[PDB]
């Protein structure tokens, strides 16, 4: 957990050759102590101090661990820890070197690089995920009374069913 957060993204290419260095399972499974005993107590005590504080911490963790799942849902990336997008690296002005980024730069310094335009990227991504990609997919299966009738696409289908 967090075991190479100080490494460069090339030595934190090591982090995402493992489970993003165990970050997500540490997000949801560090609940296990307050999951193991909010209920092992059999005591009256007539009032509760943790009955609001622990509950607020718990539902705070849950809504934070659902906003990110919904944001991966909105960019077609739901399930996939590492996925690619149709949004290009745009006019976004931190254009620099590949062998500088993924060899000698930590994740935190990288966050300091692109601390601006991050909401620009987040607004930008769903645009190419939806506004044309979903509409192109809607163009796919509407008009083809000739979808049963396909003669020169069998080769891709055969390749595709094996690989």
């Amino acid at each position: 957990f967090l075991g190479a957060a100080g490494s460069t993204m090339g030595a934190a290419s090591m982090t995402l050759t493992v489970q993003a260095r165990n970050l997500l399972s540490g997000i949801v499974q560090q609940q296990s102590n307050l999951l193991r005993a909010p209920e092992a107590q059999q005591h009256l005590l007539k009032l509760t101090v943790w009955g609001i504080k622990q509950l607020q911490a718990r539902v705070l963790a849950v809504e934070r661990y659902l906003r990110d799942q919904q944001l991966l849902g909105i960019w077609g990336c739901s399930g996939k820890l590492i996925c690619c997008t149709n949004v290009p690296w745009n006019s976004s002005w931190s254009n620099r070197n590949l062998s500088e980024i993924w060899d000698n730069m930590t994740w935190l310094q990288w966050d300091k690089e692109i601390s601006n335009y991050t909401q620009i990227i987040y607004g930008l991504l769903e645009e190419s995920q939806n506004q044309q990609e979903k509409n192109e997919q809607d163009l796919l299966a509407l008009d083809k009374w000739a979808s049963l009738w396909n003669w020169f696409d069998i080769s891709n289908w055969l390749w595709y069913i094996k690989l």
Epitope: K144, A146, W159
Partner: antibody
Framework: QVQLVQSGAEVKRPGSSVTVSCKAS????????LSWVRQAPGRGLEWMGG????????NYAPRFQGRITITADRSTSTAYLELNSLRPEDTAVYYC????????????????????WGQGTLVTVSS | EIVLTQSPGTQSLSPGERATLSCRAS???????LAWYQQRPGQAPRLLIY???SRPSGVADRFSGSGSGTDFTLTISRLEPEDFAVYYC?????????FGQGTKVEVKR
Amino acid sequence: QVQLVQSGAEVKRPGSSVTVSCKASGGSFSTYALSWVRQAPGRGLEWMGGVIPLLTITNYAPRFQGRITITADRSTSTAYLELNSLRPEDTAVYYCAREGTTGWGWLGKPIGAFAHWGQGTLVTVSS
Amino acid sequence: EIVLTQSPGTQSLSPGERATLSCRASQSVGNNKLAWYQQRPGQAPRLLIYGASSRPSGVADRFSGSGSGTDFTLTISRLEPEDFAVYYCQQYGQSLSTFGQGTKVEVKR
């Protein structure tokens, strides 16, 4: 790369039938749509029809259907075309062409386009 | 049957001219499936742009296809002395197909 060494040009009596070969080399004889095209010696180009050797799917011509025969014999790894009724208006060059694939190889996802080709021989009848 | 009808005549352009062709058809090809076929007399008719948008590794970048639906478009920025030949496009959409009509590009004196 993918090499389609077509058999040579031929002379033959008119009114008879004709056979031509296209021996592939490299990539895969099967699992990719080998096909066949025409061009009259001076005209543009013209597609006729093909074959898929793993499932013998024959997708034939809009007009030459019934007179064309394409096979696929993977046990000696060739591909033959049999046309009939030789005539001065069957005179065209007959290129044998294979569908290509993505990446530099012969195994990945196909493209749908006649990428790799063969040398072609003019199939002209003799009087 | 989709009668593919490209329609510039002789593309009598100078060496170094934008080789833009008409490249249409009778009706719309399904799923924009079009391939782009350069051809020389006696040689192999060679693919340029598969799917009318993407180009394989090895084909020169000066070949460039565009358009969709019924009529596509090919532009070629630089005209080299070896590309002066006849150009066609061909559908891989509907189960029947036909090639381009024939547009010759040449050296212009």
